[PDB]
Design a protein around this ligand. Structure first.
Ligand SMILES: CCCC(=O)OC[C@H](COP(=O)(O)O[C@H]1[C@H](O)[C@@H](O)[C@H](OP(=O)(O)O)[C@@H](OP(=O)(O)O)[C@H]1O)OC(=O)CCC
Ligand SMILES: CCCC(=O)OC[C@H](COP(=O)(O)O[C@H]1[C@H](O)[C@@H](O)[C@H](OP(=O)(O)O)[C@@H](OP(=O)(O)O)[C@H]1O)OC(=O)CCC
Ligand SMILES: CCCC(=O)OC[C@H](COP(=O)(O)O[C@H]1[C@H](O)[C@@H](O)[C@H](OP(=O)(O)O)[C@@H](OP(=O)(O)O)[C@H]1O)OC(=O)CCC
Ligand SMILES: CCCC(=O)OC[C@H](COP(=O)(O)O[C@H]1[C@H](O)[C@@H](O)[C@H](OP(=O)(O)O)[C@@H](OP(=O)(O)O)[C@H]1O)OC(=O)CCC
Ligand SMILES: Cc1c(C)c2c(c(C)c1O)CC[C@@](C)(CCC[C@H](C)CCC[C@H](C)CCCC(C)C)O2
Ligand SMILES: Cc1c(C)c2c(c(C)c1O)CC[C@@](C)(CCC[C@H](C)CCC[C@H](C)CCCC(C)C)O2
Ligand SMILES: Cc1c(C)c2c(c(C)c1O)CC[C@@](C)(CCC[C@H](C)CCC[C@H](C)CCCC(C)C)O2
Ligand SMILES: Cc1c(C)c2c(c(C)c1O)CC[C@@](C)(CCC[C@H](C)CCC[C@H](C)CCCC(C)C)O2
Lengths: 250, 251, 251, 253
């Protein structure tokens, strides 16, 4: 169908054949991220490659060892269950990011690594992801790291530049500023990615439980497992996938 | 009363405007009561009162309520029938009923000036001061445009030892989270004491407010005897009842 | 022309509304000439043009000038009698003669929307593009009042691949410094290209503007031959003589 | 040979019980306050009480005036003073943000540099008579600087300059200010007296000619002069501070 077109276009523009094999599976990432709308999936593919060549410091190296320290510290875990809509749910925790040891680029890379791992799941291509950022422990040094360059790339990676549907961004324990940072974007923003950005603040337990019943760690309201558990499980996973993360590295 | 005879002299010797507010004992006592009969502080307070009055004629000269009656009618302002448990008088201001395409920040300030002028006659109010509740539900970009740096100063100035009323509490409810950032920037410029008297309750104000004002708030805010519409109407009638006294103290 | 036949085909396949603009050979060209005859890019624009037309009915539906005639009469907007050294059409907007008490942002928008549709007809203006000048002297808080976020996105979208005209220059003069503050934050969310084509000459413009548009500016900005007055009458005479054609392309 | 208000000021200082140390209450000292207020006894006394009030509220700024803790900042080229006075006898002080590394130095360290310099120049009768003008070159201004200027620092800055230091502020000139500073300035303008508002100058990126009017013939090459560089006057001032390090100890606690 539109897969027949996509491949042809890919040949024509001389889309880099490496490191990712241009398989049918890989092309359906783009098709699925755009509900099989050919123009749109192709525009995304182009933006994907465009973003990678602009950012070799981020895109070229997906090998996890360089950031093993950050995984071990407890920055990042992925829930064992999908949410009610088939989304994968990812958790990032600022407290467990030493801004002295890891730069914003190192932290970004974590997400890139996780994204590349979860994009292979057909269910995840279909139902996208939801990212939770627990901002407790937010410092001034974290902010320092978030430059215009970095802000811009955070945007693109959710602005038609990576084959994943962002179904929701949840922030908990954000400092007051984030709301100012955000009151000045709410009405500036589209209607689309505005029903998907949730600032829960300090009093987050109840609203978090409404979006993600029966599947959250004890820290955020659940009762089956802890953040430390899912951090280790996702880290074990990421390491069990280091050969694959090399195969798709420059 | 301690210092009334001294203040009487100072007032003459300094040549304080004898009109429009006539220098009755009851008038000079406001200043004494406002500073717990400490003559010096009272005298400093009275000089500040006049200094502000002369630097903001566009605010102090005219206390005739008719210009702002539309605003009162719209349900912007009311005063609770009861005093709080420490004798304070309690004023309620509702932002949602200030239509900033029809009334400026000056019109709104003038409403607080009218109300303050009327309540300071109550000895109990002079003794136990005042508390103001600001309901910021419905706050607009358009309200903010009216709060110029120039208006911010005049607000601050009247509150800085320049009106004969003890400020016992400022309560915000339903404030936009921005109000917290602005607060952080202001805090170091404020005394310890006044900081302890500013409360930002948020959208979940109901139970934290009920601790400061049990039994007296209107139904909208957790009370159960009367409505905001009633106290607005009551206070509106009262301002207009006083329209002549207000004109008599107007330049 | 390379892709002239091809484009119509895609339009016929998508069934793009037959009217109010008839899908003539001349009307399609605009989108090709806008994207240097790039078949894929011409299309995207044309999709986004109709896409933007349906999102903002209250802007794109009516292009009848007579609603804004008084705004034109006031002398808000003018266009140079000559093209620039690159063939761009130069457009001037003077905020001073926009009365936010009489005309809204949607109204002032409509003026630009009318001028644009007229000048895009001209082959050369398609090819070389357009430069805007915003004489922001006389800027008031009641003007920013009208530039809502709801309007800011509608403004930005118009310039964001949603109209068949080449933005070749945005010049701002007599900016209230706060315009530099707003521009700081739009920088990251801007491509390198149009960033260069944006100029903030400030209070000192005469020299910086002269090197961009010599021989062809009006006296107010360092010309000689005519005045803003003249070209506001002429450009007003032109939009009014077009009122018939403007009606045909309305709904 | 009697200075107006001097003998009275001494007695006011005695009735109040003003701290004898670290700064001895010599006539030379009292005169700072008198001259700062054109020999108006009352206002010089208000001023002197304010100086002492602000010192107690900011001991982390006021106690240590020893130069060695901020020597690194001076070596870096942050601060200089012009050899010449301007045409009305003011000492002219130049501060350069670009040479301030906020990783190494806090706003308090920076603030202390001004306090040292101010304490040295106040000893000059001419500077007591004709005040100071200060040029802040904000080229290089970073987010990391911004974050050092908390509301608390903003207040302490405000307070020092509000009737609390015996130096006449005769001009504040900013060059290469980010646009933000104009917004901030618009917000505080109502809070400022007319006389001070007319003494604040934001010159921008194109400062060259505008600054040349206030300070002809006397500026460094970097700002349109011709006789010396900023590097020269930074080093000359560093050395001067360091040769004053003994006096600076004697006015510390
Ligand atoms: C650089 C300028 C800043 C900006 O624009 O931000 C918007 C950005 C991007 O939003 P979007 O990429 O347009 O959102 C996608 C979004 O990424 C994608 O997931 C959506 O698919 P789906 O969730 O509806 O299945 C998809 O739906 P449509 O193509 O409109 O049908 C879009 O809504 O959203 C970001 O998540 C917010 C971070 C600031
Ligand atoms: C941006 C500049 C702000 C500033 O400079 O503070 C000025 C003003 C200060 O209000 P005050 O006049 O100091 O408050 C009086 C306050 O008005 C008065 O009621 C207090 O007496 P009492 O309530 O305890 O009897 C009285 O206590 P003391 O006489 O100082 O012991 C004071 O707290 O505070 C205002 O509430 C500003 C709020 C935005
Ligand atoms: C909410 C999103 C806001 C946004 O980002 O839009 C900004 C827009 C972006 O620039 P552009 O309108 O996409 O620029 C076009 C531009 O519209 C078009 O005229 C240009 O053609 P030409 O003038 O170079 O021949 C064309 O050149 P290229 O095809 O890229 O080589 C493009 O650069 O530039 C605006 O004109 C700036 C106004 C603030
Ligand atoms: C957020 C609130 C900020 C604020 O209020 O600060 C006011 C402060 C007070 O300036 P001052 O200490 O009064 O200034 C002196 C000023 O220090 C002194 O030089 C002036 O004397 P002279 O130089 O003209 O002889 C003297 O003249 P007057 O005797 O008071 O008329 C004053 O202008 O001025 C500061 O320099 C702040 C500048 C940004
Ligand atoms: C494909 C993909 C990537 C690559 C991704 C995310 C998502 C949902 C994706 O689908 C979420 C996070 C992000 C954009 C990287 C975040 C990196 C920074 C350094 C984290 C630290 C601090 C943030 C300022 C905290 C809040 C950010 C949210 C508003 C996104 O990485
Ligand atoms: C004697 C007296 C006056 C005269 C007075 C008040 C009080 C408590 C008094 O005792 C409180 C209000 C104020 C200062 C007038 C404020 C008028 C403004 C324009 C209201 C609109 C919006 C404000 C952003 C609401 C928040 C107010 C607090 C931050 C003070 O007038
Ligand atoms: C096709 C087209 C349109 C339709 C257009 C413009 C250009 C260059 C076009 O090519 C420029 C002006 C604009 C966006 C009209 C703006 C409407 C408002 C009400 C103007 C008033 C004030 C603005 C706050 C000025 C800022 C915008 C400039 C920086 C461009 O309409
Ligand atoms: C006696 C005295 C002191 C003590 C003084 C100054 C002057 C003129 C004095 O006479 C000027 C500077 C100041 C207030 C210290 C400022 C320290 C800050 C941390 C500098 C860095 C950045 C500021 C954002 C620069 C702009 C400030 C000006 C608008 C004053 O210290």
């Amino acid at each position: 169908p539109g897969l027949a077109e996509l491949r042809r276009r890919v040949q024509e523009a001389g889309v880099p054949q490496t490191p990712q094999p241009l398989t049918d599976a890989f092309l359906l990432r783009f098709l699925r991220a755009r509900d099989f709308d050919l123009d749109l999936a192709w525009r995304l593919m182009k933006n994907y490659y465009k973003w990678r060549a602009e950012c070799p410091e981020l895109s070229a190296d997906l090998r996890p060892r360089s950031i093993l320290g950050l995984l071990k510290a407890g920055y990042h875990g992925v829930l064992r269950s999908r949410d009610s809509t088939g989304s994968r749910v990812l958790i990032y925790r600022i407290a467990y990011w030493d801004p002295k040891v890891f730069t914003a680029y190192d932290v970004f890379r974590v997400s890139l690594i996780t994204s590349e791992l979860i994009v292979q799941e057909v269910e995840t291509q279909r139902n996208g992801v939801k990212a939770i950022f627990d901002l407790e422990g937010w410092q001034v040094s974290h902010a320092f790291q978030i430059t215009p360059s970095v802000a811009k790339k955070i945007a693109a990676v959710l602005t038609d530049s990576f084959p994943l549907k962002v179904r929701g961004i949840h922030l908990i324990n954000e400092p007051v500023i984030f709301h100012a940072v955000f009151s000045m974007i709410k009405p500036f923003l589209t209607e689309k990615i505005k029903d998907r950005i949730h600032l829960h603040g300090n009093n987050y337990k109840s609203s978090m439980l409404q979006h993600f019943p029966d599947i959250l760690p004890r820290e955020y309201g659940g009762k089956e497992f802890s953040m430390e558990d899912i951090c280790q499980e996702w880290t074990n996973f990421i390491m069990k996938s280091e050969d694959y993360l090399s195969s798709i590295s420059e």
